[PDB]
Each structure stands twice: as C-alpha cells, then as structure tokens.
Symmetry: C5
Subunit: 332 residues, 5 copies
C-alpha cells in the first residue's frame, strides 16, 4: 500500500532541489500556570503540520484521507520543529504517543501532536500590581534553513484557534494573534519563525485586600492618638510605636512574594508614603511632650489642648486624602 521499505526517508522530499512548503495550524487547549519569580508560562497546544510527499502515494478510488496507527511516523520523514526560548517541554504518551498520521492518496500528509511547553516571558513590574504583560510562543525549524524548508501559517490569521475554557484565576487573557518574522544565526543561516502572541491583565481586588486596606487601616489607627489626653504618655507612645512596626511588617510581607527587581513598584511608593505618615505621628507626640515639660519647668522656676494636636487633627487626614487622590489619578 505505502511501499515504505522501498524508500530511504533520511532525506527530505525535494532533496537537492527547491524548498518544501510546510503549513502549521495551532489550537491552544489551556494556559496552565504563570510564575512571576520564574518569569515563564506553561501552555498546552495542538500542533498540526501539512506537507506533501510523493513517496507515500498509494492507489485508491475515493480520493479520501486514510488514518494510520502512528507507529508508521518513525519510518517516514517528518518536519523538524522545536520551540524557541523554552525551558522544558514534552509530548504526552498515554495511552500511546498522542500522534496522528493521515495520508492522502496523492501524498498529502497531515501530522498532529499534543505537547506541553514552558517558555520564557520577560515581564516589566514597574506598574505592579496594575501592570499589563505580553508574552509569545515561537515555533522555528531546527535543522533546515529557509533554503530547504518554507514555514508559514496555513490559513494566516485563521490558523490560531483557542478553547473556550482558557482561564486564569488572577489574569485576564485577551488578543490572541499570529505573526511571522525571520531569524539569523551567524554560523548556520536564515530561519523562518512563527509567533503566537497574547496579552495578560491582572485583577486588582486581591492586591487591594492584601496590601492597600491594611496599610490605610494602620495609618488611620495612628490618628486616634490625637484625641487622647496628652498627659497619658504610656498610652500614646506604644500606640505609635506599634503602628510603625506593623507598617514595617506589612512592607516586608508585600516585598517577600515578588522577584528581586532593581526598580521601584507602585505598591512600594504607596507603602513607603504610609510609613512616613505613621513615623511622623510618633515624632509629633515627642515634640508635644518635650514642649509640655519645658513649660512646666519654666512655670515652677518662675513661681487644655496643645496647638500641635489641634492642627495635626486637621492636617494629617487632608494630606493623606490628597496623596490618595493623586496616586489613584496617576496609576488608575
């Protein structure tokens, strides 16, 4: 039927002659994980190849595609494709290798693989946790240059399809599309790359509850020290100290879960401003206590509400509100 034993398949079709066209269709099954510290993502996809090989021609009367077991794959020539800038990947093998082989009577061949790929994606956290990130997956031939193999999307924009169940708990996925670009290696020649592009957006709610509310609550807990009688030194001092230390703990806990980036994120700006306010509260009380002591000493040697508290009760909330307005007008 196929006369496999009569041919040497160590050479591509057209060997010694013009390049062989190869078309690609991709269907994305899922996006399994995203790792900010590792700066990568894991995708499961169906990779489909189209090419023609006269050596697989067989007689028939119905002009219909016929399906073979898939162990025949290792006896015939198959296009060499690999994922560029990946960290690890594999082909699923239960209950058998998830490999399809269909051959038409005139030699047209359809080849399909189910693979899982972990690939690198460089992300900019300068607007975290309000950032928008983009990632891509690159498909390129390994052994054959553009002189031997021509790689292209089979149906252009319509070659990429996605399952309706693609979802992430933290990220919104949008704008899947495909592009084509060339690549050059100084010692091997020119290669043709295929691209799968998509965009990711975060949900802010979780970060609000984890960071922004606790810091605001710690700032507001430092303003009750302005309504307590200043004669209660052992009540007013520990309150401010505890609020400062809790703010420090919040900052450390927030920074613990992110990659060790050399630049400043928006959450760092917010937390450090809140910390500054909490610190200023303690300094303000220390000034008040010192001035009261000075006045007592002067009065005895010569023999109400302090203005600082009265003005702080107004100044601190207004400054904090203005800061919040400007911050959330800039970062939105």
């Amino acid at each position: 039927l196929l006369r496999i034993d009569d041919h040497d398949f160590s050479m591509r079709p057209g060997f010694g002659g013009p390049a062989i066209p190869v078309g690609v269709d991709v269907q994305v099954e899922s996006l399994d994980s995203i790792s900010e510290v590792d700066m990568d993502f894991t995708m499961t996809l169906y990779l489909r190849h189209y090419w023609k090989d006269e050596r697989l021609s067989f007689p028939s009367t119905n002009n219909l595609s016929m399906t073979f077991d898939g162990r025949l794959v290792k006896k015939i020539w198959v296009p060499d494709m690999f994922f560029v800038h990946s960290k690890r990947s594999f082909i699923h093998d239960t209950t058998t290798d998830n490999v399809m082989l269909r051959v038409q009577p005139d030699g047209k061949v359809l080849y399909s693989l189910r693979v899982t790929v972990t690939a690198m994606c460089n992300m900019d956290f300068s607007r975290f946790p309000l950032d928008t990130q983009t990632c891509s997956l690159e498909i390129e031939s390994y052994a054959y240059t553009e002189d031997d193999l021509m790689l292209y999307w089979k149906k252009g924009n319509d070659s990429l399809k996605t399952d309706e169940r693609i979802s992430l708990s933290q990220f919104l996925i949008q704008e899947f599309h495909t592009t084509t670009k060339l690549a050059f290696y100084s010692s091997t020649g020119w290669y043709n790359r295929l691209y799968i592009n998509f965009t990711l957006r975060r949900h802010i709610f979780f970060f609000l509850l984890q960071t922004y509310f606790p810091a605001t609550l710690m700032v507001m807990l430092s303003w009750v020290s302005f309504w307590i009688d200043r004669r209660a030194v052992p009540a007013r001092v520990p309150l401010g100290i505890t609020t400062v230390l809790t703010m420090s703990t919040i900052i450390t806990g927030v920074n613990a879960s992110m990659p060790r980036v050399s630049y400043i994120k928006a959450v760092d700006i917010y937390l450090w401003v809140s910390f500054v306010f909490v610190f200023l509260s303690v300094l303000e009380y220390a000034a008040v206590n010192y001035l009261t002591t000075v006045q007592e000493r002067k009065e005895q040697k010569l023999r109400d509400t302090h203005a600082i508290d009265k003005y702080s009760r107004i100044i601190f909330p207004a400054a904090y509100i203005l800061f919040n307005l400007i911050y959330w007008s800039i970062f939105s």
Copy 2:
C-alpha cells in the same frame, strides 16, 4: 498458531470498509490526589478494550480464550485511545508492562492496561469551604474518526466499576456514572467521546477548627474591654490593637492556601465581618476616652460607667449572634 508474519497490521480491520466497533470497560482503582491550586486530579484505572480481528484467528477445539505474553501486542493492530484534557499520564511497567492480551479462536480480542492519569477539573470556589465540585475523565480515539471506529461503553451503565478502597481524607466521593457525547474538530472530523463523572464534597470540620473558631475567639476577646475600668487607658488600648492585628494575620493565613481567584468566598465574608467588629471596638474606646477628657476640662474650667460602654456591652454580642444566625442560615 497466529500467523502474525503473514499479515500487515498497519491497517485497521475493515480497512477501506465500514467502521470497526470497539467496546470499553473501566474499573477505577483509586483517586490519588486533588489540587485546588493546580485544579486537577489524579486517578488510577484499568482500561479494557474489546474488538474483533479475523487476522488473529486460530484453530482450536474448546472455544476458550487463550492468554499471550503481551510482547505480541506490538506486532498486531491495537485501538488508538488517549485521555482528553489531561496534563500527564503513563503506563506502569514493573515488573513488565502491565498489558494483557487475550485472543479467542474466532478472532475476538481482549486488551487491558493499567494507567495513571492526571486530568484537569475546573472548580468553583464561590461557596468555599462549603462547596460541592464535579469532575470528569474523557476517553476519545486520536487517529480514527467515527467513520473508521465506533467507540461505545461495552455494558452501558454497568461498564464502570469502582474499588471499595477509593477514599479521600478531605472529600466525600459519590455518584460515579458514565455518559457519551460527540466532539468536532474543524480540520479532522467527528469523534466519539466517553465520559466518567463523579461528585466531590468537603468535610467542614477542619475548616471550622482552622478559621471559624479562632476568629470568633478573637471577636470575643475584644468584648472584655467593656468590663475594664475606662481609667485604665494603657490596658484597654493595646488589647483592641492586638486583637485587630491578630484578625488581620488570620485573614492572611486563610487566604494564603487558596488559588488566586478574582471573586469572593464565604470565608472572606465571615472574616471581614469579624474584622469590622474588632475594629469598631477600638473606635468605641477612643470615643469614650475623648468624651471623658472633654468633661474633665469643662469641669475644671467651671470650677461611674459611661453610657457608651453600658450600651456596647449589650449591642455587640447581639449583633454578632444575629450575623452568625443569618450567615449559617444562608450558607448552611
């Protein structure tokens, strides 16, 4: 006996003609793990295939099935089946491949595999930790469409059997059953899928002890500040502050172990309401202290139990109890 060398098994029985019927029996051995963060499960099952192949016919006098070693499997045609929407799977191989092959004199073949499959399961945590989840395992042919291969359950509802030792420490497993549905791929044709469905329910006790009791205890520890003399400012302030901070720590610890979902869970509602109560206690004491200071200043310039404490001692417990009644009437 079998004349394997006289036939080409690269083509299915009936090649070029009508589709070949294939029956499936499944026996579930165990459910090994469930991962909320990964949103998958691991199952170990016995997969059994039934079909007929005249090319394996042999003479006999007893009309009995004969068992072969299993290395013969790779010399004959075997149905191509794979698990859909899986993450990883394998066939056990100790001390040999766990593969059974039995052939009847008239060509009927029984084929059995022991496999372990990790498969995806989308779960809704909107009622966590009082949620009920459902999952499924899908069996579909890879290479052959419904025109070449007809896939069905061998005995309908009786095709699925479960071992009595299937058990999870946290989940209750119930309602195993099977269904059949078709699937369509735009470039390859129609396929016939088999389904194994089951339902999972959580045990609430662990979550009660981990989250609900500590938060209630922290709320109740904030009500002892209403029975302490209000003149003890350095005793009443740190108590409320410590309770608020402990409630915050509880909220963070509860959220740490779950997937980063964009929606609200019931435990979040309970914890945030408890946090609100604890915060209000501190605000109440601050109001009491301020009013006492105002009265002292007025009396000196002109020259018991405060009503707020007296009413709070009644109001706070009743509101908390009513909230608990409504919450546990809604979520049950």
Copy 3:
C-alpha cells in the same frame, strides 16, 4: 546450549494445560520513607521467582546451576507480576539492569529483581501521636489467573527475610510476616495474592517536646497573674491576653503538619483544654476588676486579697493536675 531460537516463548510452559507453579522469595533491604499527608510508604526489596521450563534444558555432567548475563531474559518467558495498590515503582538499572538469571540443566529457573515500590497505606490518626499503624505490600499476577498460574510463598513463613539495617528515625518497625489471600475481578477471573505485613509505632519524645511542654508552660505562665497585686491592671491584662494568643499559635502550628482529617486527635483534646484554662484566667481577672470598681463606687456614694484570687490560686492547679492524670491514664 539453550536453543532459544528453536522455541516460541510467547506462551507459558504448559500452555493449554494445567497451571504452572511459581514460588516467590522476598528479602527487604530498607524502608526509605513514610508520609502521613500522602498516606504511603517506600520499600526497597529483592524479588525472587522460581519456576520450571523444559524449553531451557541443556546437557551437563555436574547438575549445577549456571548463570547467564541477563540480556537472555527478554528472549524467554518470564512470570508476569506487579505490585497492587502502588503509586509508582521502578527497577534499578546501574550499571546494568539489576536482573539475575540462573538456569539448571533440567530446566529449573531462578529469577531475581531489585525494585523500589511506593505503596498506599491507610492510617488511623485518632490516637495521634500515640498511634500504632499497620501496612502491607501485595504481590499479584497481572495477566494470568489461578487457572494458568499458581502463586505461593516458596518456603511459607521462611520466605520473608529482612536486613538488619532497616530503621526509621521516628518509627519502630516490628512483626514482619506473610499471608495469602484470593482476589476476584468481575470481568477477568480469580487471582492469588501474596502479602507482606508489618507494624509501626511512634516515639513520643519528639511530640512531647514540640507540643506538650510548650502548652503546659503557657498554662503555668497564666497562674502568676494570681500573685500580682490586682491594682496593677495594665500588668495583669496583657499577660493573660498574650498567653491566650500564644496558645492559639501553638494550636495552629500543631495542626499545620498533619493531614486534613475530619475527626479529633488526642493532641487536639489536650491543646483545647489548655486553651480553655488560659481563657478562664482572663475572664477571672475581668470579674475581679469589675467587683473592685463596684465596691469603690458604693463606698464613695455612702461616704487585701480578693476572695476570687485566693480560691483561684488553689483551684486552677488542682484541676489541671487532675486533667493531666486522667488524660495520661486514658491515652497512656
């Protein structure tokens, strides 16, 4: 010598006739790990098979066993055995497959494998950390029923031997023995199972130091509040609050390391009783403070050691000691 090329080894000896006897010897090399959360164990063992095959007969004059390389194994019939209710296992392969093959002149064959098996073991933690657990390893044929293959222990009780270096840092291992039982599958027939049983016991010392001493110390630290003058409210309140919060932290830390079981363990009983005592201390001080305030108000309007402290100093230690006596008489 062996005339391997002259025989088809795809059929068992006696094919079509009576069942072939197969004897098993097992020597346990080590117990590598136990996982409470995974509920499994890992064992390394030497598995030895005994059977007769006339097709391997060769002429000789000394009636002595001869050893072959082990690549011959894949050319001859070998009994099909697998481990039941396992999670994963493999055969060691350095520097070659650890497989022995010895054939006697009359056809007697000895076969030996070095394997590592991870197997499930259901454990009851209702008496943790004073529990005693039992586990078993099951050996059964996969392809052949009791009509084709008879599986038995070669020397009965003497078939199981253990290395003197089997040891676990936390568990005491005792009472290795073997049993035999039949198994039935509704669609394949009856099989004969072999069992390896052993018993595990914990060492209590580690758990004493981790849980029982800290909780008792936290309870005893709450009784120093009964010897401090009750006029020191800001000294007596934070002490009780801190002890309650530390007890809560201890409970959470203890529960963190165990599987999410739906039932109550002994350590939970001990910790919750200790927590109750610590909570009652705080309530007792609140009552004392309130009564003192009431008496002061009455005396002013009309114009030592409080009995509660005096009785608590006796009542609390005696109740705690009685609880310890009963607890350690019940759980031993």
Copy 4:
C-alpha cells in the same frame, strides 16, 4: 578485527570454570549534597573495571591499547556491578553515554563509567552541632558470587583518588580510604564487597550565630529587671514575659530544621537551661511583689532595695557563667 559476530557473549569468560578476576579503580569527582533529614549523601565518581577476555583478541604489531566508540559495549560481556544500599543513581548520557572501552591485543579490557550515586548514611546527632559523622559507599556484584567472579581493588590503597575540588560549605571532608569485606545472602550465596570510607566534621560558627548568641542575649536581657525600681510593676512584668516567650520561639525554631530524633542533643540542653533561667527571673519578681504587698498591709494595719534583688544581681550571672564553663568543658 574483533570477530564479535563469531561469539556468544551471554556467558562470562571462563564459564563453567574458575572465577574471573575483576579489578576496580575509583576516582571521586565531587560530593554534591548531604541531607540530615533524609540521612543520605550524593557522590559523583569515575568507576573503572579491569578484566581479560580472550574473545576480544586481535592481531597487532605495537602491543598498544586501542579505543573503541562505546556502542560496542552492548555487544560484549561486561561485569555486573551495582551500588549497595543506594536510593537512586544514573549514568550521564550527554552528548553520548559517558562510557569508555579500550581493548588490548591480548584481550585485556579497560571499562570506565561516570555515575552519580545517592546512598544512605546513618548519622548520630547526640552531639549535634558538634558531631563527627562517617559514611561509606559499597560496590558489589549483583549476578555473580565469589565462585564466578573475584572482586578486588586494583592497586589496594592506591586505587582511590580524589579531586582537589571536593568541598562542602558546612562540612570538612577527611580520611578517604578503602576496605574489603564479604557479604552473605541466605538464598544466593557469598559476595565480595568493596568499601569507600570518609569522615565528615561540622563548622560550629554558623550554629553559634544562629542559636547560642541569641539565647545568651535573651538571658542577659532578663537581668536588667534587677536594676529597675521594683515599684515599676508594669515595666518589670512584661520584660520577663517577653523574654520567656522569645526563648520558647528560639527553641522551636532550632528544633524545626532537624530530623525527628527520639534522643537529646546538646543544643537542647543549652536552650532548656537558658529557658529555665529566664523563667526563674519572672518567678523571682513575683515573689518580690508579693512580699512588698504583705509588708504594706501589715504596716497599715499596725498604724530601698529588696534583699531578693540584691542577691539575685550576684547569683544569676555567676550560675550562668559556671554553667557555660561546664558545658563548654564537656562538649568542647
């Protein structure tokens, strides 16, 4: 040249006759890791075998060794060796299997493998973190007894060489040497084992900084309560309570990182003695406060520095210093 096709290599040289001598040389490349909780170590080594086989003889004129590709290895007889009491091991395979084969004209064969072995090592932590541990790697034949194969060190003591780059960040490695001993299996016969022995010693500095300094600092922080005026009850009570709780946290953190051993380590002795001192400080202050209250009551009914503080200021430091002297004279 080698006439491989003319011989059956399923039988050892000398099959049916006297045992074949096999010499072993080992060169250690690195020690990769040590795990106290797993009680094992990982070593990378070069394993070299020497034997003679007349079936590989070839004509030559120069009496020189000739090197072959290494795919020839699987066509000839190779000694069967494995590592005893190992957990996992493998042969490196990039860019090809790291296997050397050299054959001399008279049949002498040199065989070399690069392997990585993880092996068990039982360690005694009774003097931790001042302990000295010893470990060994055992090489034994699997299939052949001492009647068929004689295993020995090729050059005795000079057979073991080590790379100068063997180093661990925490451990000092010394005293590599080799020994030989026999082993007996009740069902297979006598085997000859080869041993590689070495000694490990810890660096104390890290443990000093992690445990011993913090505990001493916490003990010294409890002695400042003896210089504060005893009238400051709310200052002296929380200090002692906080020091006790911090010591408890230190003990838990120290125990967290070690295996769950049933016996007592030296660090446990040191930490528990320090804890006892810190606890006694709190009890001492409670006694002082009670006695002051008694004296006040007696004086009123009838109508400086307390001796306990004065003696404690001397007694506590001297006892702690004596304990340190004895502890560091015993454990060195």
Copy 5:
C-alpha cells in the same frame, strides 16, 4: 549515495594513525537560573562540531553541503564530548531530537546539538551582597585522549557567540570569553579541555530595601527614647526591648536565605553593629533609672534632664553616622 552499509563506524577516522582534528563552535541561548544554596547555574547552548571523514564522501557536481534527516547520526562515527563538573544535562527531543547533520561531498561533516547543562560554580560570599562572581563551563572529550583526538576552538575568540536576550533579573552578565587548557588523569592519559568564562555582578537595590533600610529604621526608632521624660518607665523600657527583638528577627530573616557558610559576610557586620547600638540604648536607660532611684533615696534619708540622656542625644547619632561612612567607604 553514502554507502553506510559498506563501512564499520566503530573506529574513529584515522584509527591506528594520527589524531583527528575536531573544531567546536558554541552559541549561548540563555542563562536560565543561578542557585546560591546549590552553587550551580543552568545554561542552554548550541554545540557545533567540525571534522572530516572520508567514509562519508559522495559524488556531486556543485560542491555544496547536503542536509540529512539526523537518524543517520546513529549509523556513523560521532565525536565523544561531555561537560565536565556538571550535575545534570539532557538533549531536547521535541518534536524530534534537535540534532543536525550536514555532509559535504569531500567528507566534511557539521554536527549540531541543542543541550541544557547544569554545572557547578564555586562562589565566595565574603563581600555579599556586594560580591562579584565568576563561573565557567568546560567541554572535554571522554573516550579519546590527545593522542587520538585534537580538540580546539574553530575560530578562536570568535567561536563563542551570545544571544542578545541573555538576562538575569538580579545579576549583570559580562565578559564572555574562551580559553584552552590540558587535563591529566593518572590512569587514562592527557585530555584537552575547552572553557567558556563569564562574570556576574549583583544589583544592590533589592538588598538595600530588604535589609539595610529596616535595620537603620530600627536603630533610629531607639533614639526617640532619649526625648521622652525619664519618669515614664513603662513607656521607655518596652520601646527598647521591642527594638532589640525586632533587630534579632531581622538578623535571623537575613541569614535564613543564604548558604550555611563558615565565614562572615558584610551584611552580618552591618546588622551586628546595629544590634549593638540598639542594645546599648536599653542599658543606658537602665543606668539612668538606677541613678534616679539612688538620688531619691539619699534625699529622703537626708530629709530636669539627666546628663546621660543629654549626652546620648548627641553621641549616638554621630557614632552611627561615622560607622556608616566608614562601612560604605570600605565596601563601596
């Protein structure tokens, strides 16, 4: 075309004669990870080999290189290369083995592999986190000595090329270059090694925010105790105690993430000096309280700002600033 069946490729070209030259080109694709605790790095690279073999000569008219499938590789002789001092490595295999084979009509052969290598790198942390580290990758032949195979860089310095996307989030990568050196094994002979060298530098910002700012803030929070009236003992004591304990927690958290090195790092110097300052603050207050008590007792028996506070308010900040100036002038 190639007459593979007519030659034995178990012997290198020139077998029995002069050494065969082999050239190497390397292109680095990425640096995937660096592990301080494991002391290794992971690199993905393209390894290219050049050699001549007359046995692969074929007739042609165009003097052009022809590309073969890559399954031919296992039928011909291929140079034996491996990575020295590696921990693990593999060749990527999707969708096929990423192996290129190109043969010129005169027998010149180009061979290319895509591999991932994890290799050891000894690092000195004595200047952490201001350290600069160097690492190298070593390529050496395994089976063949310099008498049989001559290994060299194909284009010298121009043989090493790097992708523009090589980047690490924490480290700056610079100065890629190549060197050549010989290696000697006492039992096998001389080998020729190739080296790939590069330099790594850290970004200080992350460590500043994680360690240096919190410790400075904790030191500055201990200087507010010098502006509070010394009569407030219960306010001034807990402040110093809390600052000391927080500094201890910072030290432990900093040390937790690094390898257990026996020497001192710069961050340890900074943290321990800050801890000393914080401790001295508490000792200073204790001295002040004791002296005040002594003066009170003397005055009663005979019947402002203390100088220590006044001098400490100046001395502590100046000493801390001088320490910072010297530290950051030494470590830069």
